[PDB]
Every structure is written in structure tokens, then in C-alpha cells.
Design a binder for these strands. Structure first.
Ligand SMILES: [K+]
Ligand SMILES: [K+]
Ligand SMILES: [K+]
Ligand SMILES: [K+]
Ligand SMILES: [Mg+2]
Ligand SMILES: [Mg+2]
Ligand SMILES: [Mg+2]
Ligand SMILES: [Mg+2]
Ligand SMILES: [Mg+2]
Ligand SMILES: [Mg+2]
Ligand SMILES: [Mg+2]
Ligand SMILES: [Mg+2]
Ligand SMILES: [Mg+2]
Ligand SMILES: [Mg+2]
Ligand SMILES: [Mg+2]
Ligand SMILES: [Mg+2]
Ligand SMILES: [Mg+2]
Ligand SMILES: [Mg+2]
Ligand SMILES: [Mg+2]
Ligand SMILES: [Mg+2]
Ligand SMILES: [Mg+2]
Ligand SMILES: [Mg+2]
Ligand SMILES: [Mg+2]
Ligand SMILES: [Mg+2]
Ligand SMILES: [Zn+2]
Ligand SMILES: [Zn+2]
Lengths: 91, 127, 202, 212, 25, 97, 97
RNA sequence: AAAAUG
RNA sequence: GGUGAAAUUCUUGGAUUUAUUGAAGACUAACUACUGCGAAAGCAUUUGCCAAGGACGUUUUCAUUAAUCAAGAACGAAAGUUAGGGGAUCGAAGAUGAUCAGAUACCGUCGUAGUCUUAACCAUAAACUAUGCCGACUAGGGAUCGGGUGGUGUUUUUUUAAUGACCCACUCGGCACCUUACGAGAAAUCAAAGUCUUUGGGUUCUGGGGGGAGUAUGGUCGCAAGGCUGAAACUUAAAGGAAUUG
């Protein structure tokens, strides 16, 4: 049975700290506790260690990332523009 | 055989600038305006004020050594009117007959590629 | 501990002695273990590589940027932060860069930086939600928490102390020429109140 | 109580080594002083003069030419090509309703070092026997024409220096080459290289400048 | 009055009614 | 009732048309609805063509023209008489004068 | 495309899935072509390339990862490398390069 | 430019 | 500078104006149309990539798989909300100058939120063609967009031809238009709003005099603003539509 209507992971906090803060925390807690796809072994086995560290349980490869996501949108944009600048410089 | 400047008539509404410069435009010669020639605060853009300003500008240009002018006439442009004010043609005629020779008349009104949303609100000036 | 950004232990070979030298870089986002990091003038424009500022094109995103060449990294070191290469002046060789604070700085073109953005971004988007979490955050940084308000003190303890109501009493904007013991509040404030409009004037 | 024209001197603008006419006119500047050099006040001035005046022919009444002063050589300002632009009246006259306007622009480097942006324009036209009153292109014709013009401009630059590019622009041969390469797509009446914009200059090369 | 401003006045009055009903319990 | 058979605009098969600003008062009006007039006026008519020709350094100069597409809102066009109120039958006439 | 040929081979021909069976087929010389996923570890890819060089076996580099290669060969599990033993009635062995 | 009420 | 006229404002610390540059964000002029695409809202610089779509052509394929749809879903202008970024312009609020009898309005000068973007909410517009969708048939005509077919066709070169553009004829699909309406309608007008007292092709939704009132209450959705659903008491002989003459 669905145990909570909307709080989900933030049901641990009970009625404290305010609903808006609880939702803000819930989004990032789900993000940080989700399993992610490994770009090296292709499995959905990447989990966070401390903030910014994302380790695959399989293949034991760990990558630097966001505090609560494996890849921030800013880092993805940075990677894309670095690829663009590198390709332009080489050609 | 002539010494060429640039006329640079900025004929807005509410004013007319007759601003003769060198060929580069960095050095200016006898910038005169309609508000310099009238003292009524509403005839600053008038053809008579523009004619007086152009006559003074051409007199000082002939005293400096400028004999001919390439003409560049503009409206306010940007997003405001795009139509030359009532004084531009009068200033150009006064420059034409003040002894100055005329060359390469062009309209240099700044025209956007649909930039810089126009002032006034979506319902415009309601008079 | 005490750092939002994770660190990367990058092992290099000593060019002058047979041994390994471990270096502690600030991990850039995308850097992984087993990755080859290239550091030098001829290193390629790849994330995690250490390049001189002059060798990267306009718009490049770098991190751990040297203020002076050889200082081994001063700018854009906190998690999620980066420096933007916004121009070069090859004569009197210098690089114009945008710092995380929005300042524009001219740096020597020989100063090095790490390609990419510092890992651990988005950290401050999560509410701490708890005095306990703030406690554990500052337990590994310094004894700066919790903070008693100076207005809650006695006059002996703070310029804001005292009064039959808790109130500042005089303007909290304090001159830059004030002395120690006076610089409490908004030191050398150019303005006060809620920021409305656009910052970074010309 | 100054009359700043007593402290001013006149210089002659010698634009080309190639246009038709060395003399374009005069410009005045303050006399060189202790802490203010007239040669420094000059050497950055741009003069926009008509290609009709540069060539002696009124068939170049449009296509204003920008000339940037590079050196002051004994009361003579030697300039060089700085850009070309059509006149506003010519552009507005060319742009008409009931036809397709095709614009292309490329950023190309000349053979030696000059970075320029070339803006070419063209307009669709009716055939001699056409009954239809608008003669619009199908935007695939537009894409193909734009690609052809881009290739033409990028290969006409990158094979010549700035001087030879100016000498190619003056007779408008690029317009004819665009017409020849696009006539099998759409008739394309009013082909023009409407603008050349200088983006980045090489190292000075006073020797290269000294061709006039 | 104008229909739009009548609707706006009704919305303001509805907000007032909601506020007083909330203050009561 | 419906005054104009199609509408007081020209929009069928579109739904939305981007607006333009009136040259006179800057009111927002959809481009298909705005009254558009082209001005091809000579750079110098000014009762002055001969004066400028005499002052000109070039023989047969052929002074240029200013081209301006004016967009008027309905109220401004009617007030400035670019367009006039027509009879019920005359409204159904799209031929220019 | 490569996917239709691969599906035809799976449907009609003979194949082995996985690194160990691929290497065994290479060393017995009954592999006609090996398809290596884009995300295969570089050391394993190099070893497969060396085996295929020794056995004169063609190597095709699948643009997708192991998930994509498994999907292409029609399996619900990741496949890092495929080995074609017999093409069946499929032109994969000749419609390459 | 200003012009409300019956 | 601005206006009808002014003043607020800036200005010999050089304003406005001129030239050369740089930065920023927004926008995408002219071309631009009784033109195109999209379910609608909407969509207008180039190029690349990604999937998608209508129409046409088809002596391909399946064979009734379809039409419309309570409940249920997806999208849904602008404004507004939340949190970052950005914040050039314009600009609810606000401040000011004027006008005025008053003018916290129109007009002038600034200017916050907003305008832009990302991640989410909101779910409303005169969201309009105030015209549900599918199907059939009933006038005359010329244009135009996309595809196709044909020609003793015109022009372009590549060497035979050919596509490309154009012309002529036809055709399918589309945005529309003009004339007349046998027909319809209260009329305005309508090729559908026709094929309706000679009333039945299929189907969904909505209305039942004007107010009270989209109000109260309850429910539900929403962070909120609000959205959806939604009375009754009471009151009233008119309100309303189109057209005619003044
Ligand atoms: K004035
Ligand atoms: K405190
Ligand atoms: K105190
Ligand atoms: K703003
Ligand atoms: Mg009016
Ligand atoms: Mg009034
Ligand atoms: Mg605190
Ligand atoms: Mg105390
Ligand atoms: Mg004290
Ligand atoms: Mg004090
Ligand atoms: Mg006390
Ligand atoms: Mg009416
Ligand atoms: Mg609409
Ligand atoms: Mg009465
Ligand atoms: Mg004034
Ligand atoms: Mg079109
Ligand atoms: Mg455009
Ligand atoms: Mg429903
Ligand atoms: Mg919106
Ligand atoms: Mg303003
Ligand atoms: Mg509604
Ligand atoms: Mg409706
Ligand atoms: Mg009723
Ligand atoms: Mg009526
Ligand atoms: Zn892994
Ligand atoms: Zn208007």
C-alpha cells in the first residue's frame, strides 16, 4: 500500500521544519539516494558516497559529480562547450 | 578641387541638428541646432530654425575651409519615429544654397532588426 | 572533511627520480578514478586537464585557477564554482577571466587552471533543516557556530548590546576607517535594504 | 577665446594602392604638441567614402567603402580597406514585396591573416513569360542557394589577400559567379555582396601597407 | 459596473470572506 | 452583429499573428490587422530638387529615396485619415485608390 | 541498418553472446565477425582486437553500449560483444566497411 | 490644450 | 530632452550631437502575403543533430481493425506563484512633472515585480470562425499553397537528354476568396448557418425569461492567487437579438 500521500522520504521529519522546506529537501533526497546508470559498465549501480562522489557497486569505478546528482546541468553544459571548443581548436 | 566634410543632419521631432564634421567624423565643424536659433521651446524642430542653424553651420564651415559636404540625414530611428523631422529638408536646402557644394546624400537613420521593444505600452499613447 | 567539493588523488611520475608523487587536486565534475589527467602547456582541452590560461580559447570553463603562475591554485575552488575565460591579450600576455563572484580579473597567461567545473555543485540548494546539521557542518570547519546576536548582548560585550529593547541604536553601517571593536554590523556598506533590480554596475 | 581651428592642421587621405584614385579628401587634426601627438590622434580614423568616388564611375554609387588610416607619412594618411557596405537607399530599393529575399553570411579568413564576415544578398525573380505574380522560392531552393553562396564566398576568400578580395569586389565578379552557380536553382535577379565586415586584423606589416 | 471590475470586486470580497472565516473557528 | 465578413483583420488558418507597434502612438496591433503604408519619398523633394542639383558636385546625381513601411493601428489610421470610414457596401472593396 | 542485419543473424544464423564465448570462438576460428559495444572496457576491446587480428576476424564497433547491443540482438540482458558463427540468410558479413 | 451635470 | 504647451531631468565636472571601440540581455525588422506548418495554445536569423507529421504517388500490405465519445489522461497565450540564473529594453506597484475643480487618470520623466531562461506549479482568455466531430450530396468562377500526370510548350547547359524556374491542361489535398443564392434564416448574413412541419446518416457537449449569481454552502484541485462543481431565499415584465426611420 502507498503509505504516504505526498511526503514520501520526508515522512521521517514528521510535522517539523515546514512543508516547503520538507518538499525542497525531499526532491534532493530522492535525487541523492537514487541509483544511476554507470557510463563504464552500463549497469544501474551508481550510488552516492559523500557529496560529489558517485561510486558504482559493480566495476568499482567512482566519478566526481554533483552534491545530489551524478551530473549537474551546469557540468553537462560545460562538457558540451568544452567538446565544442576542443573540436574548433583542433579544426 | 574641393574640401569635403559631412553634413550629419539629425532631424528629429522637437529638434534639428546640423553637425558638420570632417570626412572621418572624429573632428567636428560648427554643430548648430534649431534650439540655438529659436527661443520658444516648441519651434526647435521648425523648418525656419533648421534653416537658420544650417546657415550658421555653413558660414562657419566656409570660414574654416570646408567647401563641399557629403550629406548624411537621419531621423531618431531606433524604435521611436523612423521618419525625418520637419527641419531636415529645410536644413539641407539652407546648406545647399549657403554656398556649400553637396555630395552623396544618404539616409542613415538607425533601423533595428526588430530589437528593443518600443516605448508606450501595448495600448500606446492615449490622447 | 570541512570541504563540500571532493578531492582527487592524482599520481604522477617524478621526472627526475624514480618514484611516484601523489597530488591532491580538487575533483572536477566528470573526473573519475582510472582516468588519465594531463597537466602542462601541451595538454589537451579535456575536463580534468591542467592547462595554462593562454592555451584555452575564449569561453572555456576552468577551475582551481592560479592567481599568479605557480601558486598552485587560488580561484574557483569551492564546490560547483568555476572561472570563465572571457578573453586574451597576447601582447603583454594576459587572460581576462570572470570569477565566481562576477568580478573580472586579468591574470598572467601562464597561470594554470583545471578544465571543467568543481564537483559537488548544488550543495547549498538543500536546506540544512536542523541546528544539528549546522552543528555537524561547522564541527569540521571551525568554532563559528552558533552565533549569538550582538543585539542580544550587554553593552560591555558588543556595540549592539544593551537597551530596554533589543535594538541597534545607531546606524549599523560601519565606516571602513573604524577600528577593531567597532566593526560590527555592515562594514563599509555602499547600500542597504533588499536588493531590487540588476547588480554589477559599470 | 580659443578658436581651435588655429591649432589644427590638414592631412590628405591616400586610401588605396588599388582602388582607382589615391586622393579621397582631407581631414584636420590638432597640431602635434608635447603630450599629444597628431600622428597618434590619427592612425585610427575610419573614413567612409563612396565606391563611385573611388572608381570615378556612378555605377558604384552604392557600396560605400570604409578606409582605416594605418600610417601618417609626411602629411599623408595612408589608409587600407576596413569594410564595405551597401547604401540604405539601395538596400531598401532592392527589398520588394512579392519575391523571396535570400541572405547568406560567412566568416572567412583571407589567404594571409584577415578575418572578415561577408554578407551576400539575392532576390528571386519572375521569368520573362511568368504569369504568376510573386515568384516565391520553396525554401529548399533557398537552403541550396544559401549553401552555394556560402561555398562561393568561402572559396573566393581564403584564396586571395585583402587587396585581391577588394580588387575582386570592385568589378562584382562574385555576383556573376553566384548567378552562374544558382541559375539552375532559381532565377535570382539581384545578387550582390552587400557587406564585408572586418573582424580581426593581422600584425601591422607596414611593409604590406607600403604598396601605395 | 463593468463586468471585469465586478468580477474583481467579487473576488476581493470573497478573499475577505475567506479571511474572516479563517480567523473564526 | 458581425461588421466585417472575414474580420477586421486578415487571419484565416493562423490562430496567432505576431504584433507590431503603431508608428504614431505605439499601440500593439497584430501585423495582419495593422494598416501598412509604404513611403518612397525622395531624399529631397522639399521644393528643392533644382537647388540641390545646382549645389551638387556630380552631374546627373539622381538623388536617392527614403523607404519606410508605416504600421498604423485602427484608431491612429482613422484619425490621421490614412483610412476612412466607408459605407456598408463600400467596405467590401479591397482595391486601393 | 546494422540492427536489421543483426536481428536477421539472430533469427536465422548462429551466434555467441559474451566475452568468454566470443574469445573461445575466435581461438577456434569459427567466428566470422565480432561486434563490440561502444562502452566495452578498452583493455577488453584491445584484447578482442588482438584475437581478431590473429584469427583474421572482422571487427564491427557497435555505436551503442552493452544495453543497446543486447537490445539489438534481441535479449533482455547486456551484451558486451557478439560473435557471428554463421550468418544464416543475412548479408551482415558482406555489407560492412 | 480644456468641455462635468440635467 | 519632452510635449498640443510645459515642467520634472541632464548640462562649460562638456549634456545632446559626432567618430572609434567594448559589454550585456532581449528581439528576429524590411522580405511578410486574404501565404505555410501545428490538436490547440502557437510557430519567422544561419547551420548541425534528433525524433515526428500532413498531402501526394502507389496494380505494396492488413482486412473492419472504425466514428463520436461520460469517467479518465496529455498539452494548454498572457498574467501570476516557488527556487536558481539573468536582468539591455519596456514596465502592474511606487515616486514625480503637468493638466484639472479634484486627477494617488489619460500625457511627461524615472522606476520595483514582471518582461528572458532553467526546474517545477498554475489551467485560465472575446483560448473566436463567439459556428463540436465523422460521413454523403446540392451552384457558377478565378486565383493561390503542397504533391502528381501530360504537352510538337518557353528559358537555363552537361555532349544526346534531363531535372531547376516558368507557361498551358488536368488532378488530389489545403488556407481562402468572388458572384448568385434554387435553398436557409428574425435579419445581419450563410456553400453552409443548404439538402428541416416534404420534420430521422452517426454521435458528444450545452441552454430553457431577466436578476440574485457563477453568489452562499459543501466537496475536490492548487503553495497561493484561484480552477472545477454549484444552489436557495428573494425580486422582476420585461431583459435581449437583428434590422428601420429619425
Ligand atoms: K522641442
Ligand atoms: K543568533
Ligand atoms: K543596544
Ligand atoms: K529588470
Ligand atoms: Mg483619440
Ligand atoms: Mg484629454
Ligand atoms: Mg545565522
Ligand atoms: Mg541580557
Ligand atoms: Mg560599547
Ligand atoms: Mg557605535
Ligand atoms: Mg531587556
Ligand atoms: Mg456595433
Ligand atoms: Mg488566439
Ligand atoms: Mg434626464
Ligand atoms: Mg529641447
Ligand atoms: Mg512560406
Ligand atoms: Mg529576418
Ligand atoms: Mg472529461
Ligand atoms: Mg505563460
Ligand atoms: Mg522608461
Ligand atoms: Mg472559459
Ligand atoms: Mg466559447
Ligand atoms: Mg434562465
Ligand atoms: Mg440593437
Ligand atoms: Zn560500473
Ligand atoms: Zn496608433
Amino acid at each position: 500500500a502507498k503509505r504516504t500521500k505526498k511526503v514520501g522520504i520526508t515522512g521521517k521529519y514528521g510535522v517539523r521544519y515546514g512543508s516547503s522546506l520538507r518538499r525542497q529537501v525531499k526532491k534532493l533526497e530522492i535525487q541523492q539516494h537514487a541509483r544511476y546508470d554507470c557510463s563504464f559498465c552500463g549497469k544501474k549501480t551508481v550510488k552516492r558516497g559523500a557529496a560529489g562522489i558517485w561510486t558504482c557497486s559493480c566495476c568499482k569505478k567512482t566519478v566526481a559529480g554533483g552534491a545530489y546528482t551524478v551530473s549537474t546541468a551546469a557540468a553537462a553544459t560545460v562538457r558540451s562547450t568544452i567538446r565544442r571548443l576542443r573540436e574548433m581548436v583542433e579544426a | 578641387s574641393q574640401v569635403f566634410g559631412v553634413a550629419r543632419i539629425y532631424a528629429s521631432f522637437n529638434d534639428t541638428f546640423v553637425h558638420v564634421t570632417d570626412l572621418s567624423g572624429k573632428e567636428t565643424i560648427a554643430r548648430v541646432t534649431g534650439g540655438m536659433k529659436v527661443k520658444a521651446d516648441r519651434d526647435e524642430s521648425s523648418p525656419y530654425a533648421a534653416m537658420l542653424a544650417a546657415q550658421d553651420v555653413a558660414a562657419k564651415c566656409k570660414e574654416v575651409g570646408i567647401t563641399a559636404v557629403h550629406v548624411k540625414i537621419r531621423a531618431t530611428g531606433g524604435t521611436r519615429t523612423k521618419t525625418p523631422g520637419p527641419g531636415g529638408q529645410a536644413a539641407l536646402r539652407a546648406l545647399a544654397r549657403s554656398g556649400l557644394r553637396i555630395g552623396r546624400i544618404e539616409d542613415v537613420t538607425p533601423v533595428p532588426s526588430d530589437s528593443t521593444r518600443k516605448k508606450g505600452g501595448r495600448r500606446g499613447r492615449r490622447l | 572533511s570541512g570541504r563540500g567539493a571532493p578531492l582527487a588523488k592524482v599520481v604522477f611520475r617524478d621526472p627526475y627520480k624514480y618514484r611516484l608523487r601523489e597530488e591532491i587536486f580538487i575533483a572536477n565534475e566528470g573526473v573519475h578514478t582510472g582516468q588519465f589527467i594531463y597537466a602542462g602547456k601541451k595538454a589537451s582541452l579535456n575536463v580534468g586537464n591542467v592547462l595554462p590560461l593562454g592555451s584555452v580559447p575564449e569561453g572555456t570553463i576552468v577551475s582551481n585557477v592560479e592567481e599568479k603562475p605557480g601558486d598552485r591554485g587560488a580561484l574557483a575552488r569551492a564546490s560547483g564554482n568555476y572561472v570563465i575565460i572571457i578573453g586574451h591579450n597576447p601582447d603583454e600576455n594576459k587572460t581576462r577571466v570572470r570569477l565566481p563572484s562576477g568580478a573580472k580579473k586579468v591574470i598572467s597567461s601562464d597561470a594554470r587552471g583545471v578544465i571543467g567545473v568543481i564537483a559537488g555543485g548544488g550543495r547549498v540548494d538543500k536546506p540544512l533543516l536542523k541546528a544539528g546539521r549546522a552543528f555537524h557542518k561547522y564541527r569540521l570547519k571551525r568554532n563559528s557556530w552558533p552565533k549569538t546576536r550582538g543585539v542580544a548582548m550587554n553593552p560591555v560585550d558588543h556595540p549592539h548590546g544593551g537597551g530596554n529593547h533589543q535594538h541597534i541604536g545607531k546606524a549599523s553601517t560601519i565606516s571602513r576607517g573604524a577600528v577593531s571593536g567597532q566593526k560590527a554590523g555592515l562594514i563599509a556598506a555602499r547600500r542597504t535594504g533588499l536588493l531590487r533590480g540588476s547588480q554589477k554596475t559599470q | 577665446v580659443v578658436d581651435p581651428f588655429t591649432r589644427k592642421e590638414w592631412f590628405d587621405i591616400k586610401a588605396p594602392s588599388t582602388f582607382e584614385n589615391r586622393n579621397v579628401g582631407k581631414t584636420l587634426v590638432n597640431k602635434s604638441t608635447g603630450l599629444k601627438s597628431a600622428s597618434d590622434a590619427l592612425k585610427g580614423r575610419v573614413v567612409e567614402v563612396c565606391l563611385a568616388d573611388l572608381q570615378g564611375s556612378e555605377d558604384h554609387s552604392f557600396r560605400k567603402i570604409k578606409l582605416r588610416v594605418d600610417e601618417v607619412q609626411g602629411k599623408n594618411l595612408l589608409t587600407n580597406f576596413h569594410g564595405m557596405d551597401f547604401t540604405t537607399d539601395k538596400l531598401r530599393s532592392m527589398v520588394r514585396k512579392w519575391q523571396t529575399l535570400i541572405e547568406a553570411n560567412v566568416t572567412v579568413k583571407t589567404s594571409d591573416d584577415y578575418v572578415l564576415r561577408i554578407f551576400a544578398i539575392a532576390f528571386t525573380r519572375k521569368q520573362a513569360n511568368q504569369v504568376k505574380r510573386h515568384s516565391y522560392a520553396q525554401s529548399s531552393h533557398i537552403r541550396a542557394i544559401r549553401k552555394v553562396i556560402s561555398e562561393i564566398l568561402t572559396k573566393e576568400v581564403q584564396g586571395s589577400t585583402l587587396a585581391q578580395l577588394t580588387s575582386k569586389l570592385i568589378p562584382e565578379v562574385i555576383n556573376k559567379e553566384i548567378e552562374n552557380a544558382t541559375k539552375d536553382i532559381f532565377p535570382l535577379q539581384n545578387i550582390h555582396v552587400r557587406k564585408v565586415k572586418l573582424l580581426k586584423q593581422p600584425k601591422f606589416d607596414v611593409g604590406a601597407l607600403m604598396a601605395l | 459596473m463593468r463586468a471585469k471590475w465586478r468580477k474583481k470586486r467579487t473576488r476581493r470580497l470573497k478573499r475577505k470572506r475567506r479571511k474572516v472565516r479563517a480567523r473564526s473557528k | 452583429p458581425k461588421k466585417r465578413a472575414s474580420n477586421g483583420r486578415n487571419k484565416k488558418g493562423r490562430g496567432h499573428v505576431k504584433p507590431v507597434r503603431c508608428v504614431n502612438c505605439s499601440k500593439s496591433i497584430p501585423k495582419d490587422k495593422a494598416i501598412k503604408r509604404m513611403a518612397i519619398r525622395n531624399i529631397v523633394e522639399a521644393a528643392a530638387v533644382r537647388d540641390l542639383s545646382e549645389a551638387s558636385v556630380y552631374p546627373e546625381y539622381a538623388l536617392p529615396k527614403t523607404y519606410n513601411k508605416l504600421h498604423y493601428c485602427v484608431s491612429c489610421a482613422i484619425h490621421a485619415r490614412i483610412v476612412r470610414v466607408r459605407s456598408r457596401e463600400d467596405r467590401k472593396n479591397r482595391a486601393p485608390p | 541498418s546494422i540492427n536489421q542485419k543483426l536481428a536477421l543473424v539472430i533469427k536465422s544464423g548462429k551466434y555467441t553472446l559474451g566475452y568468454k564465448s566470443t574469445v573461445k570462438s575466435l581461438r577456434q576460428g569459427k567466428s566470422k565477425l565480432i561486434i563490440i559495444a561502444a562502452n566495452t572496457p578498452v583493455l577488453r576491446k584491445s584484447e578482442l582486437e588482438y584475437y581478431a587480428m590473429l584469427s583474421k576476424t572482422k571487427v564491427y564497433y557497435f555505436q551503442g553500449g552493452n544495453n543497446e547491443l543486447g537490445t539489438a540482438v534481441g535479449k533482455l540482458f547486456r551484451v558486451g560483444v557478439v560473435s557471428i558463427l554463421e550468418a544464416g540468410d543475412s548479408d551482415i558479413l558482406t555489407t560492412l566497411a
